[PDB]
Design a protein around this nucleic acid. Structure first.
Lengths: 100, 351, 55, 218, 65, 65
RNA sequence: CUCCU
RNA sequence: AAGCUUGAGUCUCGUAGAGGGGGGUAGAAUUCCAGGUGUAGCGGUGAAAUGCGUAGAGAUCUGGAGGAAUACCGGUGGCGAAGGCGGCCCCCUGGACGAAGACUGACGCUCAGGUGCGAAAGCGUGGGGAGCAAACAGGAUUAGAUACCCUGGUAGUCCACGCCGUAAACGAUGUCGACUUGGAGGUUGUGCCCUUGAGGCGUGGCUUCCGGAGCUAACGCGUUAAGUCGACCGCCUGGGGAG
């Protein structure tokens, strides 16, 4: 199907809910016949510039393969959450492995 | 027939592109131009300065054979790049033999480090090496008799950019340029670099493995603006240069060359700047408030109209001294900043 | 009726300085001899700084 | 055959495309002139030189090239022929009616200055009239003994003395030149594809021409 | 721009990088939207670039000096 | 000059900021391809990678944040 | 203002 | 009437791209508002004044709102029939290109009338309005100054839906096809070989400059022709009156 390369950043002092969030989100993708190809969490690292008077966010890389309606509902759930600051969904074409 | 075709591939087989096959016979000498004929299109306009060995006078008469170099063809009319670089390959082969030999033994004599490694000179050429290479241990050749005779034992070579630091005394003991551009960095690491082309604002000395340096016009000497770099240094010559600046973006290492006769000026400020030493100096142009004696290696503007005699204001130096004459003048002040020594002439015997 | 003033050497300087200040970022109206072109360009580059310090 | 001089081929990329019959692109991005076609054209040139020099005709040798300067004087005064090697004056042949009295100034001035008033007026006048003689001497010295219009013109570079060729194609003089790869073989009657800028070559071609002239005079 | 270093510092480095990129973009952006003559001024600038390069290249023959 | 992305077999990813910080200057500005000497395709991929990494705050826009 | 062949 | 494959078209892989429509989001900056510190000027010009400021301005810091455009990359680079299209991401979608084959079999070119698209300004309806800015006011300048310059400032610039249908809408060069010496570059694919090294030799497309013959009244054009020809269309017949 369509490939996606989701990188979403996480508000730092709510980062203990992140292993729950990954389980809910890849549970939601896996509930619609979709694979997954990466899970890479980069941990709490330093922002290059303050996002909402705030440094040092917690980054999650997913890089999933899923259909369009599932990835759209997923992006709306990234919107309607105050824990999630700056999600990002990206291109198709043959999802990949370890990056940093 | 195919005599000529075969003849052509034969002549292809019996030449190569670099300065490898010692083939050009020197067929006319005239100062200051040598000229050969290595089986190429024309005859090289050779400088005389690729062919005098280690004390200044020529070594090769008519018929003599050195290879030159190639891979550059026709700038309008003519053929080569110089045979002296040829020589570099031979030096590389000997160094390889030492590395290859496991070691290379010649003579290396290294008095001091321009940039942290004693300088070693082999035969005609002199090379610069990193600071450790000069001495096996912490012996230091500063206490050794000056410009001493050992050999060179190699300590370190940079393999791309050509810097080789070699081992004096102790006979018993036996993308790519720009990521890690911190080696020659730190403020003033002196380098030995061949200049390439002088662009009337610059000189373009660039040696250290695929980089570009400028030494533009402002330093170059101890005169600023009237200099014209072609007059003052050379074309194609290995010189004194160090970094002074490396810019990570924009890729402009801005080298310098005034880090030399600057010292002579400092010595003049000192040497004769200890107190009030007397100097015998010649005036060059009297500019209605002084006389401008400028003997002693480029020390600029000097004696003021105020002393000149034992009368202050009325004197007008053209009436009282000369044009172009060597006089008594003693120092009275050297100002280290703003480059003003201020000599005088009233220090004499009238009162 | 007497002889020329500063025989093109530091007159070549101030021509390059005036031509440096009044725009002319060509650096392509100099002399052609070396001892005068060198400081036409010398006055030009000494005039770029004096253009930065003012309007 | 590359006989003794090396006349193999030339420059790199700014070849005149009219010389497509003489090319071989080498590995160093340099042309190789077809040496197995050069020799029939050179022999077709020498067979003309024996005819028009056994006519008792006058050959005019032209080449400056900064390197073939002395090879023309040396390799042409060995014959009874005439040369122009330093500066090619605009109109020495088609405006020879007014080059003539400049030759009269040269001959009529060394006649005055070998024995006559070469000291009788001023040291400054010797510095003027002598400097005039060394200005006209390497400008008209080889053409000085000609006294007529030449019957042939042997040009060593068409690209460098192309105005001498058009000069002697306004009037009817059969010019022939050794052309380079970038030269233009249009006004040249008997084109010789070869090396213009080698001292070996301007020894070889000009030497064999020098043999055909003095050996040709019967 | 940002210069902080040890005791010989503070003037030459800063007036270099400051002066170049500062005076460039501010002296550009200070007025004149133009919408039309960056097209003309880049066209004239680059036509002058190729005319200066070829002009110096074929001007590298001789000058009788 | 040399194009290091041509020396590799790469297609520029936006996450190796160790490489992308060789192509931003210290003011955050993208360095020209006449300075770095990259090929034009990897220059476009490079620019999209820089802007994308700026969006994820792995690189700064300017130095005045 | 100083990055060319 | 029956074919044939070179013209034309289709399919399998990729390739690059500010091609278009819709949605969303990011940072810098400008303006305003609230608050803090602070006080005598700010702003502007060729000089000035109108203007703003002791009712606390200009500056500096914190927060917030809103609108618009997307620095660097930026490239006589790219895509589009033309107009034109530059942050970043998603969705829907057009075209071009090349390698190797397969397939159809002249299905082609141009096109009066017609239909469609068509910068900016403008017009209608509804929103929106930061910055800029016709009109307008004021200050200058000037002999005068319904102007250039300055201080302000409304339509408009922006969005959604309709209209208008013109531009120095320009390459001042209709479209399609064939042929005819070269060089230096850009960009984008691809083949072979020692990728053994940013290497060498070819091959297609698009594009920039310089020049050859040839052409032109000259200027200049010059394989992307204004060279040699062919098919079809549009248009011209002294200047003004008069588009």
């Amino acid at each position: 199907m369509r490939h996606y390369e989701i990188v979403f950043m996480v508000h730092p002092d709510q980062s203990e809910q992140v292993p729950g969030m990954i389980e809910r989100y890849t549970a939601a993708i896996t509930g619609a016949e979709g694979k997954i190809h990466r899970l890479e969490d980069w941990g709490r690292r330093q922002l290059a510039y303050p996002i909402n008077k705030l440094h040092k966010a917690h980054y999650v890389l997913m890089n999933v393969e899923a259909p369009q309606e599932v990835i759209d509902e997923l992006e709306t759930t990234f919107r309607f959450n105050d824990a999630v600051i700056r999600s990002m969904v990206m291109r198709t074409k043959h999802a990949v492995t370890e990056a940093s | 027939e195919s005599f000529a075709q075969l003849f052509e591939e034969s002549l292809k087989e019996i030449e190569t592109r670099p300065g490898s096959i010692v083939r050009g016979v020197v067929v006319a000498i005239d100062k200051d131009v040598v000229l050969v004929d290595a089986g190429l299109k024309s005859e090289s306009a050779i400088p005389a300065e690729q062919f005098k060995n280690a004390q200044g006078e020529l070594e090769i008469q008519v018929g003599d054979e050195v290879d030159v170099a190639l891979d550059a063809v026709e700038d309008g009319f003519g053929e080569t790049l110089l045979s002296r670089e040829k020589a570099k390959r031979h030096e590389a082969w000997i160094t390889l033999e030492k590395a290859y030999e496991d070691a290379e033994t010649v003579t290396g004599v290294i008095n001091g480090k321009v940039k942290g490694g004693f300088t070693v000179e082999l035969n005609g050429i002199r090379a610069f090496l990193p600071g450790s290479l000069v001495d096996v241990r912490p012996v230091r050749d500063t206490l050794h008799l000056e410009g001493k005779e050992l050999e060179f034992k190699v300590i370190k070579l940079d393999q791309k950019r050509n810097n080789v630091v070699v081992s004096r005394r102790a006979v018993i003991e036996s993308e790519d340029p720009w990521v890690a551009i911190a080696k020659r960095y730190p403020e003033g690491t002196k380098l030995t670099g061949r200049v390439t082309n002088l662009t009337d604002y610059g000189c373009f000395v660039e040696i250290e493995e695929g980089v570009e340096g400028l030494v533009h016009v402002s330093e170059m000497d101890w005169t600023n603006k009237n200099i014209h770099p072609s007059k003052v240094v050379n074309v194609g010559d290995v010189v004194e240069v160090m970094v002074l600046d490396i810019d990570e973006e924009r890729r402009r290492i801005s080298l310098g060359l005034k880090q030399c006769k600057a010292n002579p000026w400092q010595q003049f400020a000192e040497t004769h700047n200890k107190g009030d030493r007397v100097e015998g100096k010649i005036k060059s142009i009297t500019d209605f408030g002084i006389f401008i004696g400028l003997d002693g290696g480029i020390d600029g503007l000097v004696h003021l109209s105020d002393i000149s005699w034992n009368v202050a204001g009325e004197e007008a130096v053209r009436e009282y001294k000369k044009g172009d004459e060597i006089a008594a003048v003693v120092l009275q002040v050297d100002a280290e900043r703003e480059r003003i020594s201020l000599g005088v002439k009233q220090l004499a015997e009238d009162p | 009726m007497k002889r020329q003033k500063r025989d093109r050497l530091e007159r070549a300087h101030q021509r390059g300085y005036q031509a440096g200040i009044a725009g002319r970022s060509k650096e392509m109206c100099p002399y052609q001899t070396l001892n005068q072109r060198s400081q036409w360009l010398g006055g030009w580059r000494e005039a770029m700084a004096d253009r930065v310090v003012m309007a | 055959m590359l006989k003794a001089g090396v006349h193999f081929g030339h420059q790199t990329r700014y070849w005149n495309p009219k010389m497509k019959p003489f090319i071989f692109g080498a590995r160093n991005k340099v042309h190789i002139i077809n040496l197995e076609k050069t020799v029939p054209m050179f022999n077709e040139a020498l067979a003309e030189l024996n005819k028009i020099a056994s006519r008792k005709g006058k050959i005019l040798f032209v080449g400056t090239k900064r390197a073939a300067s002395e090879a023309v004087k040396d390799a042409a005064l060995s014959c009874d022929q005439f040369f122009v090697n330093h500066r090619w004056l605009g109109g020495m042949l088609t405006n020879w009616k007014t080059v003539r009295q400049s030759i009269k100034r040269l001959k009529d001035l060394e006649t005055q200055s070998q024995d006559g008033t070469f000291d009788k007026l001023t040291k400054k006048e010797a510095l003027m009239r002598t400097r005039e003689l060394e200005k006209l001497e390497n400008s008209l010295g080889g053409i000085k003994d000609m006294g007529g219009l030449p019957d042939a013109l042997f040009v060593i570079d068409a690209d460098h003395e192309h105005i001498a060729i058009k000069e002697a194609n306004n009037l009817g003089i059969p010019v022939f030149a050794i052309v380079d790869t970038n030269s233009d073989p249009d006004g040249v009657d008997f084109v010789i594809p070869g090396n213009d800028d080698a001292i070996r070559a301007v020894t070889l071609y000009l030497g064999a021409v020098a043999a055909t002239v003095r050996e040709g005079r019967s | 721009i940002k210069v902080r270093e040890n005791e010989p510092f503070d003037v030459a480095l800063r007036r270099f990088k400051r002066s170049c990129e500062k005076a460039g973009v501010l002296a550009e952006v200070r007025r004149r939207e133009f919408y039309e003559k960056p097209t003309t001024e880049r066209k004239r600038a680059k036509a002058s670039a190729v005319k200066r390069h070829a002009k110096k290249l074929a001007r590298e023959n001789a000058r009788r000096t | 000059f040399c194009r290091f992305t041509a020396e590799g077999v790469q297609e520029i990813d936006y996450k190796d900021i160790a490489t992308l910080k060789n192509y931003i200057t210290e003011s955050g500005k993208i360095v020209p391809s006449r300075i770095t000497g990259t090929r034009a395709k990897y220059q476009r991929q490079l620019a999209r990678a820089i802007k994308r990494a700026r969006y994820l705050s792995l690189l700064p826009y300017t130095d005045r944040h």
